[PDB]
Structure 1
Amino acid sequence: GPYLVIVEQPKQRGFRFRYGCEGPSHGGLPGASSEKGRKTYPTVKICNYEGPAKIEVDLVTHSDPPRAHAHSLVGKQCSELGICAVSVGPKDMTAQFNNLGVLHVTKKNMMGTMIQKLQRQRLRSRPQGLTEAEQRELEQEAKELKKVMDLSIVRLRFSAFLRDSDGSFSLPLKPVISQPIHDSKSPGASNLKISRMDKTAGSVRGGDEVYLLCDKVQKDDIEVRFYEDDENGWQAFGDFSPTDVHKQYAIVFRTPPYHKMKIERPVTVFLQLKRKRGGDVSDSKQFTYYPLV
C-alpha cells in the first residue's frame, strides 16, 4: 500500500552547498554509489503503487524530528524557494533526481528566512491575513530553533502523494528521510581524504617521520591510523601534537610501532586518516614495511 523506498541514497559527504551569489547550476546532489565512469543520483521508488503520482521533496532539519529548514532546495523543477516536485509513469514507479542543488543561506540571514518560511506554512495556506498573534509564535518557533538546526547538514524528505478522486493529488504517503549530507565546506563536515604522503616505505619499530598532505582538518578531531585487520581489529596512531598540523591542510608525524612480532618478509598495511567525533576516513593508501638492519 502506501509504501515508499529510497533506492539510491544521497552522498552523505562531498556535496558543496552553494551560496546564492554563486549560482543555481553548480551541479546536482550525487549519490552514494555514484562515481566517475557512471554517475548516480538520489533515486526513490514506490512498491504496491496505485498508478501515476508525484513526489514533493524538501530539505529538513538534521535533527531527527523531521522539521523544516532554512536552506531552501533549489533547481529547475523546484518551487522557487522550497520543494521540488516530479511525477512518475504508470509503470516506472521510481523517481530519480539528477539536477538537485541546495541554497546556502547566510548565518546573518537564516533568521528573517526561516521565520518568513514559517509565515507561509501558516499565513500562506489556510485563511489569509495572519494575526499579530501568530506573528509572535512565528518569531518564537523560528529563533526557538536557530540553535538546534545544524546549518551545515541536511536531510531530504521524499514525501509521495496520490490523487484523492475528483482528479486531484492530495493523498499523503509515508515520507521517508535520506541520511544526512555534510556540506563539502563546513569546517567540520567535509571528507577526510588524503592528497598524498612523503616517504611511502615506513620502517619497522615505531618512530619515523613522514610529511603527509591532506584536506582541511581542525586542530583536533584528527588523528592518523593504519591497519589491516582480518582478525578482531588492530590500530596505531602517529602524533596527537597539534604543532605539527600545518595550516589545516597538512600533518607530519612519526610512524607507530606495529605489533609485527613476525619480523619476517616485508608486510604492507592499510593507512587512512580519521576524525575523532565524526569518525570519518579516507581511501586505501599502501604503507609497506621493512626488516631492520
Structure 2
Amino acid sequence: ADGPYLVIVEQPKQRGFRFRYGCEGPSHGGLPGASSEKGRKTYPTVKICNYEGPAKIEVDLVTHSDPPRAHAHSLVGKQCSELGICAVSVGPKDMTAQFNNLGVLHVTKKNMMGTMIQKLQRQRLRSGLTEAEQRELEQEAKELKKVMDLSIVRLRFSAFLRASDGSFSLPLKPVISQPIHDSKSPGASNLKISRMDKTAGSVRGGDEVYLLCDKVQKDDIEVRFYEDDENGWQAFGDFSPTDVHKQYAIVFRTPPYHKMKIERPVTVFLQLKRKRGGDVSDSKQFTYYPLV
C-alpha cells in the first residue's frame, strides 16, 4: 500500500532458456516470460505502481543466493550497456516495461575471476575509493567463485523516478525475479512424455509399456502412478536403469491398482518424476480394466 513500488507483471521462464558464450554470437533470441508459447510471445514485464510519470527501470543479473549479490554472467541486448545492465524508460501514460531482447552471457571458469573484479570495482566507486584497498575487495570473489551457481540466475529490477533536473536519481525498492535455470544444464529441462505404446492395462499390473521421453537421467528417473482425487494412493513402474535406452525411452511394467475388486474401469495419471529433482513431467492418463 503506502508509497510507490515495483512489481513483476510477468516472471521470466524458470526452465528452457539457454545461456550463451561470447563465441556463439550476440543474437540467439531473448529470454521469454513464463507464459511464452506459439506466436503469442511474452517477455519479462514489470510495472511501477502508486506513481505515474517519467522513470527508468534497469535490470541486472544476481545470484540464486537470497542475499542478492551481482552475478558473474552479464545481460546482453539492444537496450543494454557493456556492464551487463539493461535499462528501459516508462512514459507518464505507461508505467509497464517489457524486456524482449534479454540474453544471458555465460562466462568461462577461466574468465570468471577477472571479469568478476571489474563488476566488483563498482562498489569501490560509491564509497574515489582509492585502488589501495583492492585486496580487501578481492577475497569475496575468490570465495564467491566456489559457491556461485552458474546454472541459475535471477533478475533484479531497479526502478528510478526522474527529479525535475539532476533527473532519475530517486530510487524505488528493488524487486527480485524467480530463478532462471540454464536449459543446457542437466536437470534444467522440462520432463516431457512424448508418446507411450500403452494407455491401458489390467488391475493386476505387470503390463509392459514403452515410454518415449525427452532427456532423462538414468537412475534419477522414476514413473509415478497417482490419483489426485482418491486419497493420494500412488505406486510406481518397475524397471532397472538398463531399461533406460539412450536417455530417451523407458521400458517398464505397470504397478497393480490399489483396488482390485474393480467392476468398472478407473482412469489414473502417470508421470515421470526425478528422484532428487522432485519435479514431475506433464502427466498422461492411464486406464485399468477389472479381472475377467
Q: What's the TM-score once normalised by structure 2's chain length?
A: 0.90
- Deviation, 1:232, is 3.9
Tell me, in whole angstroms, the C-alpha distance in 2 between the residues paired with 1:243 and 1:34: 36
Secondary structure at 1:161 match in 2 = strand
For the 8 Å contact 1:55–1:158, the answer to whether it is kept is yes
Segments of structure 2 that go 5 or more residues without pairing to the other structure are: none
- Deviation, 1:31, is 1.4
Rate the CA distance shift 1:217–1:114 in 2: closer, same or farther, 3 A: farther
Secondary structure at 1:141 match in 2 = helix
Q: Aligned pair 1:193/2:192, yes or no? A: yes
- Deviation, 1:136, is 1.8
- Deviation, 1:265, is 2.3
Between 239-248 and 77-86, the greater mean CA deviation after superposition: 239-248
RMSD: 2.2
Secondary structure at 2:132 match in 1 = helix
Deviations 1:69-98 (A, max 9, x none): 011011111112411000111021111112
For the 8 Å contact 1:63–1:148, the answer to whether it is kept is no
Tell me, in whole angstroms, the C-alpha distance in 2 between the residues paired with 1:173 and 1:110: 31
Secondary structure at 2:191 match in 1 = coil
What is the match of residue 36 of structure 2?
34
- Deviation, 1:101, is 1.3
- Deviation, 1:37, is 4.5
Segments of structure 1 that go 5 or more residues without pairing to the other structure are: none
Tell me, in whole angstroms, the C-alpha distance in 1 between the residues paired with 2:146 and 2:184: 20
What is the match of residue 71 of structure 2?
69
For the 8 Å contact 1:8–1:31, the answer to whether it is kept is yes
Tell me, in whole angstroms, the C-alpha distance in 2 between the residues paired with 1:37 and 1:64: 35
Deviations 1:7-38 (A, max 9, x none): 11111111111222212222111111222252
- Deviation, 1:123, is 5.5
Rate the CA distance shift 1:100–1:262 in 2: closer, same or farther, 3 A: farther
- Deviation, 1:132, is 5.8
- Deviation, 1:243, is 2.7
For the 8 Å contact 2:154–2:179, the answer to whether it is kept is yes
Q: What's the TM-score once normalised by structure 1's chain length?
A: 0.90
Tell me, in whole angstroms, the C-alpha distance in 2 between the residues paired with 1:227 and 1:121: 52
**How many residues get paired?**
290
Secondary structure at 2:29 match in 1 = coil
Tell me, in whole angstroms, the C-alpha distance in 1 between the residues paired with 2:280 and 2:234: 14
Tell me, in whole angstroms, the C-alpha distance in 2 between the residues paired with 1:114 and 1:239: 48
For the 8 Å contact 2:260–2:290, the answer to whether it is kept is no
Rate the CA distance shift 1:132–1:81 in 2: closer, same or farther, 3 A: closer
Rate the CA distance shift 1:59–1:197 in 2: closer, same or farther, 3 A: same
For the 8 Å contact 1:194–1:282, the answer to whether it is kept is yes
Tell me, in whole angstroms, the C-alpha distance in 2 between the residues paired with 1:22 and 1:56: 25
Secondary structure at 2:53 match in 1 = coil
Tell me, in whole angstroms, the C-alpha distance in 2 between the residues paired with 1:83 and 1:212: 44
For the 8 Å contact 1:14–1:182, the answer to whether it is kept is yes
Between 67-76 and 227-236, the greater mean CA deviation after superposition: 227-236
- Deviation, 1:130, is 6.9
What is the match of residue 175 of structure 2?
176
